[PDB]
Each structure stands twice: as C-alpha cells, then as structure tokens.
Design a protein around this ligand. Structure first.
Ligand SMILES: Cc1cc2nc3c(=O)[nH]c(=O)nc-3n(C[C@H](O)[C@H](O)[C@H](O)COP(=O)(O)OP(=O)(O)OC[C@H]3O[C@@H](n4cnc5c(N)ncnc54)[C@H](O)[C@@H]3O)c2cc1C
Ligand SMILES: Nc1nc2c(c(=O)[nH]1)N[C@H]1C(S)=C(S)[C@@H](COP(=O)(O)O)O[C@H]1N2
Ligand SMILES: Nc1nc2c(c(=O)[nH]1)N[C@H]1C(S)=C(S)[C@@H](COP(=O)(O)O)O[C@H]1N2
Ligand code: MOS
Ligand code: MOS
Ligand code: FES
Ligand code: FES
Lengths: 1288, 99, 50, 50
C-alpha cells in the first residue's frame, strides 16, 4: 500500500509499489542516473559508495548528518530522510565545493574511482565539525580505500581544513563557507513535525517489509512474524544474503522508536538503547569517560578502545548496538568485553518486560539464555566498575583498523579492598571457535590466588586446554591464535599489575625495566616533505610544471564517466558467469533446465554453444576444469538481478581428478623451456671463496585490486555486423582482435573505445578480452547490447594476480661481504595456464644494484591448479629483486656486517656492465644511495634503534635501506611503436588522440603538456576525448612503464609536422592567433590534420648467448624505512620512510611523485599485509579474517620524505624524462627488511642463532612466531599428517 | 572522408577507388560514416563534386600507404594484405594515412 | 574540439539540409545542454515544407 | 537495416523538441502567452528569443 518518500540531493523522490529488495547504490545509479557513487566491493569495506544521510529529530529539533555505505542501505529505510551524493555538494556546471576543489588540486586523485567516497567522508565530517582536527578527518577516512595515491595527497587536502616549493597553491583555495551549505529539505521537517503512528508496508512477490513507527507496533510485528529479522543497520543481515545464500520473506525495519535509543545515566551505571549506532555509543562513552573518575569508567574504556578500531566511520554510523549483540559474530570486538562485565539485557515482549544476563550461554545461542522468538532487545546495562576492579581488551587483525580480529579478548579482575587475593576473574575470547567463549573453568581454578608469575604459568596451561583449537580449525592460523590467547593473558597480567603498583606502591613490586613498552601500543600523525626542481623556460611552456590531472575535478565531482557509468542503452541485457568450484575435476554434467525457466533469462551458453570459436591464439571450460574460478557457463538476462538468481540454479556435477597441484614444489612432478643468464665462470669462483651459503625464500602473489571491477558494454550497430566495444582495458587492439576472431569478422567491423580505466596495474588484458569475446558473441547472437560487470568476489577469482615466486640460491662470498659467486634459481607459479615473459624480466632485472662478477641465473614457470596469474606493476622485478636482497641479508648475517655495508660494497661502480653485457652509467645509483643516507640520517638512527632494542624486550625497532635499478624497455622495436592523430579546427582549437590508455597515471595530462609546448598554445586550447581503434589503429598495450614516453614522441611528431606546414603562415603573421593561422591555412589549402608516429626504441635480447641491449634506460633510486614491532602480538607500525629517485627531467612532478608513492605503498602491501589464503582443495578464502586487505591510511608511514635527484639529460627519451610507474614497487621491501631487522634483534637478545628465513608477505602471524619466547614454546602442537588444515 | 552519402553513392565510389589503389577486393574495405572527429574542416557535400574531390583525397592516402609498403610488397609479391600489414607492423611502418 | 558532428547517411537532401538544419541543431543543442539531456528533433512533413 | 537518424534507438531519458512557427507573413509580435502550455503534461521548457 504505502509510498516511499525521501530526498536525494535536495530533490523529492517518490516510489509507489516499491520493491523492498532495492538497495540504494543501484537505485542511485540506475533509477536516478547519479553515477558518482561507485561500486567497489558491496560489503561495506572500501567506502566507494559513501553517502551522507540526514534526518530531522522532531523532539530535539536537530538535524543529524551521518556517513553510510550505500551498497548496504535498503531504500525502504530512507523514508522521510535526505540522501546526499557527490553530485549534490557541487559540480562543474554549478559551483564546485571546496572539498572537491582541494582533493583534486592537491593531486589526491589518480584513477579517480575512490574520489567520490573520499569526498563524501570529508564532506560529512566537515558538516558535523566545521573546524576539525586532523585526527577526526583521518578517522572519517578509515573506511575509505585507495589503490593509487598512497593517501598522502588526500591527507594534505584534509590538513588545509584544519586551523593548525609546493605542488599546489593552498592560498588560492576558496574558503569553506559553513553558512552557504545545503539546506535540509523543509518538507521532511514538516513531515517529521507530526509523528505519524501509521506503520508502513512495502511488498513484492518475494518479500514483505514492515516499518513499525511505535514500540507497540514493533512488538505486534515481532509476535506475528517471530522469525523475521529486525533490520537496523543491515551490516550483518545484508552481507550474508549477498554471499551466503540467505533469504527472508518478511523483514521488520522499525523507524526511530524513542525507547530503543535511550541514554540513562544511572547511579549504578548506564543503560544504552539497542537502536543507538556504534558511532553514537563511542560518543556517549567518550563524554562519560571524561565526566566520571577513572575507576568507575573501566568497562567504558575497553569499549572505547575496541570501537576506535571497529570497521570504519560508515559502518559504525549504520551498525546498531542491539544488532551487534544479537548478531553474535565469533570475531565480534565488543561481545567478549560485554561478556566479562556483568552486563544485562532489557528484553521486551508483547507479554511483558524481562531481563537476562549477557553471558557465554547467550553468546553460544543456547535457547535457555537466548531471547525467545517473539521478543526484542530494548537496551543493555553496562554497570560502573567498583574500586579494585580492572578491565582490559586486546585484539589482533591483519592491519590496525577496518579489519576483522584473528583473536580478541575481554578480561576482568576484582580484588576487593587492599590485599592482592583475586576474588573474581572473567576471561573471554573471540575468533577461537564458532562463538565468543569464556574460560570459566580455568577462572574458577584461579580464585583465591595472588597476582604474580607463579599463577601465569599455570593459568596459561589450564586455558590452553580449555580454550583449545583443532589443527583443522576454520580461519587457519591455529598456532598463532594459540599464542595470542596466552600473550593477551600476559599483557593483562602486566597492565593490571601496574594500576595496583600505582594505587598501592609499598605493597606491590615495580615492573622490570625492559618490560614497560609491552603496555602502550603503536598508534601513529601523518607527516611528509617533497623535494624537486623548478628560469630560461617560457612561462607558457607547461613541461616540468606540476599540472593537475585533467579529470581531477571530474573525479572529485563524480562527472567522470567510467565504463559502467554509461547510460542504459535501449533493451540491453546483462551477462554473468557460472565459474568452476573445483580445482581439478571432470565436468560430468550441466543441468540448465531450472535456470533456463526463470524470470528474465534469455540464454545460457556453455562451451558447446560457442563451438569452433571457444578459443584464441579456451574461453569456456569444455569437459574438465583446471582451477576454481574458471569460466563454465554464461547467463544472459534482462537484468543483473535476474541473471545472478538464475546462475545460482545451474547444477554442475563434478568428479575430482589427481594430481591436485597447488604448490611450486608439487608442480616439479615432461618438458619446460629453460631461461638462463651466465656471467663470468661461477664453477671456478666457488673454489676461491671464504664461505658458501644455501638458502631459499617463498614469495606470495598479489591481487590487482583496481577499485573499478571488470566492466564492459558491447553494442551491435545493426549494420554489416558492426560492433562497438566499450571496455575498461589496457589493450584495445587486443580486444578488437579477440572479438573479431570470435565473430569471424574483419577487424574493420569491430571498434574498441576507452575513455578511462579506474586502475588496472596489468590486470585488465587477457581475461578482460575473454569476457569481451563471450559478451560480444551473446550480443551478436541476440541483436542486443550486452553489459558485463563483475562483482569483487567473482573478479578476484576469475582474474589472476601477481606470480608467486620461489627463489633458491647458492652464494660464495668473502669475509668482507663481497659476493664473487652466485648460483640462482627462480620459480614462478603460473596457475592453470601459461608467464615465461615474467621469468625473462625476472632474470634480466635480478642483479638490481649489485655487480655479481660470476653469476648463473635460471628460471622456470610452473603450472598449478589455481587461477592463471597475470603480469602486474613491476613485471617480475619485485619478486626477483627480493630474492637477491634476501641473499644479501643472509650473507650480511654470516659476516657480522649490516646488510647496508654488504650492499654498498657489492654495488655497481659509476661505469660497469650488466650480466647480459649491457654497459651502464650507475652514477645516479651512487647519488641516490648517498642522498638517501644523508636525508634519512641513517647512521644516527641506526644507534637509536640499537639503543632502543637493548632497553626493550617485547617491542623492537628495525631499520633497512635498499637501492633500486629498474631497467625500462620492451622485447622489440615494434613493441615500442606508437601513434597519434592531431586535428586543428578553424577556430584554432585542437583535438588530439593516441593509442595510450588513461588508467590514472595521467598519460592524457602529459600529452596535452606536450601539445601545449610543441604548438605553442595553452592547454585550455587542446582537448582529448579518449582512445579508439577507429582513430589510432594497431596501438600496442598500455604497459611497460613507457605509455607516456612513446605516445608523447608520436604526439610530438604530429605537432612538428603540423608546425612545419604552418611556418610560412606563422612567419608572415607572427603576432596572430591560432584561429587566424588555422583560417588562412584553410584558405590556402593546407591540411590541418596529421598522423604522428614513433617507431620504437631499438631493443634486443639473444637468450641463447645470454647477451643483448634490451633496455633503453634505467630508473635509479634508494629507500630507507623504519618500523616498530610488537613481539607479543606480531603487530607493527611503519614509523618513517625516506625515498630518493632519479626521474631524469620530470614532465610533471605532481604526477611523477604520485606514481612513486602509489607504487611504494603497493609494494609495501605485497611484502607485509597482502595475503591470499587457499584451501588444500584450492578454494580461495574470502571471508572473516581470510579477507584480503590492501593498505589503508593506518598502514601509511608516520613520516614520509620523497626527493627527486637533480636531472642529467637523456637525448634518447622524451624531454629527458624517465618513465617511472613500475619502479617504486620494489622500494616497498625497505619495510620488509626493516621488520626482518627488528625480528633479528629479538632473536639475538634471546639467543636463537642460525637459520632465520622470513617469507613474503611478512604478516603478523609470521612476525609473532619468529619472536620466540616462553609462549611460543608453551603452545600445544599437532602432527603434520594427522589433520587437514584450513589453508596451505 | 568528409563527403556525405545522401543516396548518390559517394561511399560506394570511394571503396571502388580504395579497391583499385591498394589492389584489394571491395569486401576487404569498410566505411562507417562521416565525422568531424575523424576528418576535420571538410567542405559542404554539394556542387556536383563530392565524389571527385573526396576520391582524390582517398587516392592520395592510398598512394602514400602503398609507397611505404612497396619495399615489403616487392620482397613478397604473392603475399596477402594480412602478411604485408603484419610485417609492416613488425618493421615499425605506420599503417594509417591522411589523404 | 568540444562539439563533434556524426553522419552515417542522409535520406535525400538536394541542397535542403544545410542552413536551416543547423539552426534547428543549434536550438536543439542549447536545450540539451541546458537540461543535461539528449534532445531529439524530427519535423513532420507539413512543418518541414513551411 | 539501414539506420537513418530517427532510426537510432531511444537514448536514456531523451526529450523531444518541437517548434511553434509564425502564422503571419509580416507582423509585430505583441505578446506570447506560455502559461497554459507550460502547465501541461510532460512539458520541461519553452524557449523564446529572450
Ligand atoms: C565492512 C564491515 C566491517 C566490520 N568490522 C567489524 C569489526 O572490526 N569488529 C566487529 O566487532 N564487528 C565488525 N562488523 C560487524 C558489525 O559490527 C555488525 O554487523 C553490526 O554491529 C550489526 O548491527 P546491525 O544494526 O547492522 O545489525 P542488522 O544486520 O540490522 O541485524 C543483525 C541481526 O540482529 C538482529 N537485531 C537487531 N536489532 C535487534 C533488536 N532490537 N532485537 C532483536 N534482534 C535484533 C536482527 O534480527 C538480525 O538477526 C563489520 C561489518 C562490516 C559490514
Ligand atoms: N593510477 C594508476 N597508476 C598506474 C597504473 C594504474 O593502473 N593506475 N598502472 C601502472 C602500470 S602497471 C604501468 S605499466 C604504468 C603504465 O603507464 P606509464 O607507462 O604512462 O607510466 O602505469 C602504472 N601506474
Ligand atoms: N539520391 C540523391 N542524389 C543526389 C542528391 C541527394 O540528396 N540524393 N543530391 C544531389 C546534389 S544537390 C548534389 S550537389 C550531388 C552531390 O553529390 P556528388 O557531388 O557526389 O554527385 O548529388 C546529387 N544527387
Ligand atoms: O606493464 Mo603494467 O600493465 S605490469
Ligand atoms: O550543390 Mo547540391 O546540395 S544544390
Ligand atoms: S563500501 Fe559499498 S562499494 Fe565497497
Ligand atoms: S585514485 Fe583512489 S583508487 Fe585510483
């Protein structure tokens, strides 16, 4: 019956007969055509869909603004509210908002896909705190992820809002006028000012949705539909219906019921409403903590601690307290704390009021302690702490915030007046089984005892068998979880044996001097500086100036169109894939009969329906699958919803096959092609060395995690089988080929068009093309436009990632650390398909900064039953160079020298030769190392870290410095060719295009800078629309660090041609405008269109002889990094990083510094926190703490300095610039070796010599278990083959 | 090219020109339409000369393209256009030309 | 460089698809831009002749 | 199967434009009343020379 009425960007919206299952994100984008709000992941993690929600409180007369993730908001919840998207706060065709201006002009957008989310988080916070502190701003952005920028420029933009040679003019930014902000729509005030009691009803064929607006009604609905969920924030129910196959015919979704949002300050404690958001609870408790004395605020401190880290700002503002408690997630951060604190629940039924305790049984869902089906949680009572009562909460995740806990805890002690006899004790844990569990039996056995180390040793024993985990426990990490359980117990001992010392000095002992640092933890500030260069050049010449990305403002306003933002084309269909669920199995059968009969379904294609066009140079699995995630069927439907519904009813029966190959070692049991380099004579060199050393290092893969998922639209023209293909790709010419081949058409019938890509990093090529080919086959078959957009989960599974590597080495070295002999083996994991190119680049770039006089280097790619891996930002270098640095730090260990002494004496001299006999001038390698040692103050900080580690047993620091030689060049001259097309219209304005793709690296901005210099005109006079096979044919892939270099040379070539033709006209009228020159050129029959062409850099490699000239130039750099680790939890903090970088003459230092930071953070993630968990059956794990985590703001080093080495001329390259882009990824391992250093300092002090090989990624698990102590020895262990593990 | 097809068959005539000049069947050539984005500053399609003039410009692009390729064509005279195009790419010869 | 005109085919013209066409396109494009919408203008035979 | 300009599919949310033309050969325009026209179903805008 009812009508849904809300506002979006000031405009009224009415939906009659609304479908309750409509989420806000697709509604905004599809029904309102507001495409600024993006899909990033659909689970609330990334913040790409961030919006503002406003509501008028009619009793308090106040308008409340909170941020939220639109993906998880059902529109039936928005009744009477006002949504604000990025488009609502300003645009280029109204006025731009200052938040939008500054994030753009501070270079805080690269691909731009995350920008609207960042903008709405910052906007919303400035609406609540017009004069903020940076703490508040960076807290607001805790929920917002970015894969390009490294966050630094977004942090700078935020600082300009705080009343506390640059890349942007801060003084020119127009001020935030807090009085000219958006008015809350008056109609919603008028609706609110008249409390309707009428409960709203929304129906469809599948679902009933009741919004009761009184308490009476809520209980009435909870009685009728006892099994219906009561939706508040939908951050528990939402994510599980999306990807755990759950469905609810009836929903109850109450509006603001006053009794559900109570805040009583009682005499004994406080009672908090179940409908308060977690954000509001954080505020209530922050105030209470400051207004009350600090032994009645014990529970409220532990809750504040864990609420500071809980998710990010959007989810906290959506999620309710009652939702949290009733959800009973095993990894819940608040339930283990509430469990220990004598908390009670105020239940209410139609039959009456009732009160139950919040205990283990309740958290275990025993129906005796649970709510009965017909009642609801009104409020929770958290009592004040008594004197001599102490409460503590701990947690460990993959990163410090917006990540689910591996293990957490709440613990309480009560002493009761004076003497240290423990009278009560509650110890609760999470992440250690299907629910939050309390160690009550252990706690009984400890009552009566004193507080000292006698009781710890026994307490640890008797919890370790009570709260035990089976080796096959879900979540994995069993030995780490075991350790954290007792390590948090230790930290609690320390913590509370100090408040006792504080309160009663004479009767209690002081802590051991090397123990205090265990108590305070690692919590940041974000500082940075940037040096670069800037007389003889004209002021109108933009080359070298830090010009903002051309789309920067369009990113900020959401006016930038990405592939899925394109409007619905008449009668388009949606395509979605059924993927393999087995790693290596026979496909016995496929049943499509149920799927084919379902609403909207147009077609379902298997490999049979593609027949002889199911491969290229195979798309759909035929009769076997060779990994999970492999394509099996394609479901074509009238809508995306219908497509995915129907896809989940396709029945595929499998039969597993042996062998199931998952690791690189298993894969070594026909014929592999070898690749090899040999320098000098390594067999003779091993005879004359002081020592020999063998070792190896495994290195994990990496998901691309571009923020824009795979997206395309294929549109048949309806004449001559012409297709237009709009696709987010790095290689249009390849799309054109695979689509044309699939349709058996000439290439002149298929055109591929790309305006922009929302990040790619190599992962938008082969697999993109397959999906486009399959999509185009459907489009053509049915004479319809077909759109295919992947969800994040499918995307990660179908697309590959970076190649995991295995490095084995034998190093012969001198006692001074010089490495005269080096035998080396590389092994890439290729996945199901071949990858050999990655081995080749690995071996060629293996040397990095060092001169190995005798060297044998060999590589092999290894097929396994995992998704087929692809090229990635770096192309084998981040793997290959890590192998050689590991080999160095091991040799350093065996010589008793710092790795930085071993690096500096194994470096190339100014003039020297590579293993493949290419000459190099490594002068700038030396300078990069000199300046980084100076800039960083390495020597002084080295003794500071040694000093620290001598005074701290449970917290260590480490410092490392690594150099960079990143060579640049492709296999052939032909691979480096590039083309452009330049028109001059008769008004003098210019249109340029070229074969390069804008993925956020600013290639188009650089080409207009080239055009502006070459034709001597302002950048405002030049325009570029996009990239198309129709305008520039046969263009190479946008990769290899050279897109701008090469297309820049081709653009310059067209411009010069054009200028030569015009020079007669220009000399005859030197003070004329381009409009005059263009017009007289037309009047004199001179052509104003020119193709530009660059043939490519000369390049070659003879792999038989192992010699060649593959590389045109080398990017040089160095980087220093400092970290502090927690030896008890395996946590760490990046304290400071210093980077110096040889870029030649930067064409745009804003863009080039953006690329350094971005690459660095991407490498930082590869080597520390990014980790892919596969089961023994080859299934990827994607849920709970197995969630994949890219770097957030909390991972960005507290201090960050970046210097550009002064230039020195490269007549061969475009304006002497060096294509960086891939270079900075390897510099992320400075963090890896800094942590490696810190772990060694803990291992030396405690006396554990010999083999320390830490593998990448250096996760908190790996850190902790390397810092051996009594707790590592203590934990109970399992036999290898006795159980099947959750991972590996 | 800058000419507009109004039913006079200008596009048919340009493919006949292309077919003669590059020595390939008309089935191998395609044209989509006319656009200020591809060919700028074109005059009006009138004056009885649309085909005459755009035909001369199409011929001009074709000849340019054939001159660039003549080394490749003489070295493999019985090769397909697919082979000539591919080796041209492999030798960094541009296969786009304004006429 | 901001405005591109695309023509696949014309269903006859004989000179009568130039000045007046452009006026209608100009007026049409003004509306389109003003309202951020695609705008289509097709004339009926009676209006066309007039 | 030949696409002429009006054969192009409906683009999302496109509007239609139509003209009011003069009914006099040489006359003063004393006034234009748009109030009834502007209130009618579907009407988005009416542009005069102003
Ligand atoms: C991206 C993301 C990150 C997260 N990170 C963390 C984290 O770091 N730490 C952590 O601890 N948690 C985390 N969570 C979990 C989150 O805290 C919970 O999902 C949330 O608190 C549940 O509240 P809700 O209002 O969304 O519940 P809903 O999803 O609205 O409801 C969930 C359940 O509670 C019931 N319910 C709600 N209110 C009542 C009531 N008054 N009476 C009876 N039943 C009721 C519903 O029927 C339903 O069964 C995260 C979630 C997401 C999506
Ligand atoms: N923002 C952004 N930066 C990026 C990428 C991307 O997808 N997004 N790709 C990287 C990769 S893998 C390459 S090969 C280079 C290519 O562009 P360039 O040659 O112009 O640097 O950009 C790098 N920087
Ligand atoms: N079918 C058809 N034929 C036509 C026209 C037309 O609109 N349709 N226009 C005529 C006019 S007015 C001119 S100027 C010429 C222009 O084309 P041409 O120069 O290629 O003959 O075509 C003539 N023949
Ligand atoms: O050459 Mo970048 O796409 S790995
Ligand atoms: O020159 Mo024809 O359009 S009268
Ligand atoms: S947060 Fe909604 S898209 Fe990831
Ligand atoms: S700019 Fe933030 S994700 Fe690319």
């Amino acid at each position: 019956a009812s009508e849904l009425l809300f506002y979006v960007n000031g405009r009224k919206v009415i939906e009659k007969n609304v479908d309750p299952e409509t989420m806000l994100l697709p509604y905004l984008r599809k029904k309102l055509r507001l495409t600024g709000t993006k899909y990033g992941c659909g689970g609330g993690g990334c913040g790409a869909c961030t919006v503002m929600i406003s509501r008028y409180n009619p009793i308090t007369k106040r308008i409340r603004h909170h941020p939220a993730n639109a993906c998880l908001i059902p529109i039936c919840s928005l009744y009477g509210a006002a949504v604000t998207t990025v488009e609502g706060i300003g645009s280029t065709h109204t006025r731009i908002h200052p938040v939008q201006e500054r994030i753009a002009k501070c270079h805080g957008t690269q691909c731009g896909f995350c920008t609207p989310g960042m903008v709405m988080s910052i906007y919303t916070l400035l609406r609540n705190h017009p004069e903020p502190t940076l703490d508040q701003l960076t807290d607001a952005l805790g929920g917002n992820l970015c894969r390009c920028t490294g966050y630094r420029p977004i942090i700078d933009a935020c600082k300009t809002f705080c009343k506390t040679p640059k890349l942007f003019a801060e003084e020119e930014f127009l001020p935030l006028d807090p009085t000219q902000e958006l008015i809350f729509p008056p109609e919603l005030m008028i609706m609110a000012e008249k409390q309707s009691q009428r409960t709203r009803v929304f129906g469809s064929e599948r679902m009933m949705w009741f919004s009761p607006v009184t308490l009476k009604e809520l209980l009435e609905f909870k009685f009728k539909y006892p099994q219906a969920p009561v939706i508040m924030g939908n951050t528990s129910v939402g994510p599980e219906v999306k990807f755990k196959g759950v469905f609810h015919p009836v929903i109850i979704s109450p509006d603001r019921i006053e009794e559900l949002s109570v805040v009583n300050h009682a005499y004994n404690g406080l009672t908090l409403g179940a409908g308060l958001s977690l954000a509001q609870v954080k505020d209530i408790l922050a105030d209470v903590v400051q207004k009350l004395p600090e032994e009645k605020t014990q529970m409220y401190h532990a809750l504040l601690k864990h609420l500071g880290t809980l998710a990010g700002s959007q989810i906290r503002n959506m999620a309710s307290l009652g939702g949290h408690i009733i959800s009973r997630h095993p990894d819940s951060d608040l339930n283990p704390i509430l469990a220990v604190g004598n908390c009670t629940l105020n239940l209410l039924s139609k039959e009456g009021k009732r009160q139950i305790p919040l205990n283990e049984q309740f958290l275990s869902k025993c129906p005796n302690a649970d709510l009965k089906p017909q009642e609801i949680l009104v409020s929770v009572n958290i009592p004040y702490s008594r004197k001599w009562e102490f409460v503590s909460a701990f947690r460990q995740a993959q990163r410090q915030e917006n990540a689910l806990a591996i293990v957490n805890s709440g613990m309480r002690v009560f002493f009761g007046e004076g003497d240290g006899i423990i009278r009560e004790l509650c110890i609760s844990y999470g992440g250690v089984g299907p629910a939050t569990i309390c160690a009550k039996n252990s706690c009984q056995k400890l009552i009566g005892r004193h507080w000292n180390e006698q009781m710890l040793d026994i307490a640890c024993r008797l919890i370790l068998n009570e709260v035990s985990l089976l080796g096959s426990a879900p979540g994995g990490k069993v030995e780490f979880k075991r350790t954290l359980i007792i390590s948090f117990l230790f930290k609690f001992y320390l913590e509370v044996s100090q408040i006792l010392k504080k309160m009663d000095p004479v009767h209690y002992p002081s802590l051991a001097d090397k123990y205090e640092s265990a108590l305070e933890d690692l919590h940041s500030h974000h500082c940075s500086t940037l040096k670069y260069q800037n007389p003889k050049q004209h002021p109108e010449d933009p080359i070298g100036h830090p010009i903002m990305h051309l789309s920067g403002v369009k990113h900020a306003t959401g006016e930038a169109i990405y592939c899925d933002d394109m409007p619905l084309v008449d009668q388009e269909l949606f395509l979605t894939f059924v993927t393999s669920s087995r790693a290596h199995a026979k496909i016995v059968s496929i049943d499509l009969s149920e799927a084919l009969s379902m609403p909207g379904v147009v077609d379902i294609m298997t490999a049979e329906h593609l027949s002889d066009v199911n491969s290229f140079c195979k798309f759909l699995a035929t009769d076997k699958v060779f990994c999970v995630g492999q394509l099996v069927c394609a479901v074509l439907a009238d809508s995306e919803v219908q497509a995915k519904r129907a896809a989940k009813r396709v029945k595929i029966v499998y039969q597993d096959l042996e062998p199931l190959i998952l690791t690189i070692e298993e894969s070594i049991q026909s014929f592999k092609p070898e690749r090899k380099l040999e320098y000098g004579n390594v067999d003779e060199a091993f005879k004359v060395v002081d020592q020999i050393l063998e070792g190896e290092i495994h290195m994990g893969g990496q998901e691309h995690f571009y923020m824009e998922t795979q997206s395309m639209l294929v549109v048949p023209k309806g004449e001559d089988q012409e297709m237009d293909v709009y696709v987010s790709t790095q290689f249009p010419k390849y799309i054109q080929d695979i689509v044309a081949s699939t349709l058996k058409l000439p290439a002149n019938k298929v055109m591929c068009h790309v305006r922009r890509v929302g990040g790619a990093f190599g992962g938008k090529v082969l697999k993109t093309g397959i999906i486009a080919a399959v999509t185009a086959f459907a489009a053509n078959k049915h004479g319809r436009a077909v759109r295919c957009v992947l969800e994040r989960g499918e995307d990660m599974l179908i697309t590959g990632g970076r190649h995991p590597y295995l490095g084995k080495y034998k190093a012969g070295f001198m006692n001074d650390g010089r490495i005269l002999a080096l035998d080396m083996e590389h092994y890439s994991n290729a996945g199901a398909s071949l990858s050999l190119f990655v081995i080749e680049m690995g071996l060629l770039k293996m040397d990095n900064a060092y001169k190995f006089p005798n060297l044998r280097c060999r590589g092999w790619a290894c097929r396994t039953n995992l998704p087929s891996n692809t090229a990635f930002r770096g192309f084998g270098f981040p793997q290959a160079a890590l192998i050689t640095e590991s080999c160095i730090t091991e040799v350093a260990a065996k010589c008793g020298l710092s790795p930085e002494k071993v690096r500096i004496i194994n470096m190339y001299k100014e003039i020297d030769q590579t293993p493949y006999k290419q000459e190099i001038n490594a002068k700038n390698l030396i300078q990069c190392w000199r300046e980084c040692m100076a800039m960083s103050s390495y020597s002084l900080r080295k003794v500071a870290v040694e000093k620290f580690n001598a005074e701290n047993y449970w917290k260590k620091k480490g410092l490392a410095m690594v150099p960079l030689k990143f060579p640049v060049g492709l296999g052939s001259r032909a691979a480096g060719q590039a083309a452009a097309l330049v028109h001059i219209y008769l008004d003098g304005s210019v249109l340029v295009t070229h074969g390069g793709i804008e993925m956020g690296q600013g290639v188009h901005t650089k080409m207009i800078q080239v055009v502006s210099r070459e034709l001597r005109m302002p950048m405002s006079n030049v325009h570029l629309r996009g990239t198309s096979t129709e305008t520039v044919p046969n263009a190479n892939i946008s990769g290899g660090s050279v897109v701008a270099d090469l297309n820049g040379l081709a653009v310059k070539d067209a411009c010069q041609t054009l200028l030569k033709r015009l020079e007669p006209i220009i000399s005859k009228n030197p003070k004329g405008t381009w409009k005059d020159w263009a017009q007289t050129a037309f009047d004199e029959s001179i052509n104003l269109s020119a193709v530009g062409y660059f043939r490519g850099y000369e390049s070659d490699m003879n792999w038989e002889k192992g010699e060649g000239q593959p590389f045109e130039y080398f990017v040089y750099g160095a980087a220093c990094s400092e970290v502090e680790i927690d030896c008890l939890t395996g946590d760490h903090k990046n304290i400071r990083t210093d980077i110096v970088m040889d870029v030649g003459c930067s064409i745009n230092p804003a863009i080039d510094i953006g690329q350094i930071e971005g690459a660095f953070i991407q490498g930082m993630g590869l080597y520390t926190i990014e980790e892919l968990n596969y089961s023994p059956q080859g299934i990827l794990h994607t849920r709970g703490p197995d969630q994949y985590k890219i770097p957030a703001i909390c991972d960005m080093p507290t201090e960050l300095h970046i210097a550009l080495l002064p230039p020195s001329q490269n007549s061969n390259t475009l304006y002497s610039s060096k294509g960086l882009g891939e270079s900075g990824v390897f510099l992320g391992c400075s963090v890896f070796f800094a942590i490696h250093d810190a772990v060694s300092a803990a291992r030396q002090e405690r006396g554990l010599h010999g083999p320390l090989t830490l593998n990448s990624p250096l996760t908190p698990e790996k850190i902790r278990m390397a810092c051996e102590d009594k707790f590592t020895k203590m934990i109970p262990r399992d036999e290898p083959g006795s159980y099947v593990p959750w991972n590996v």
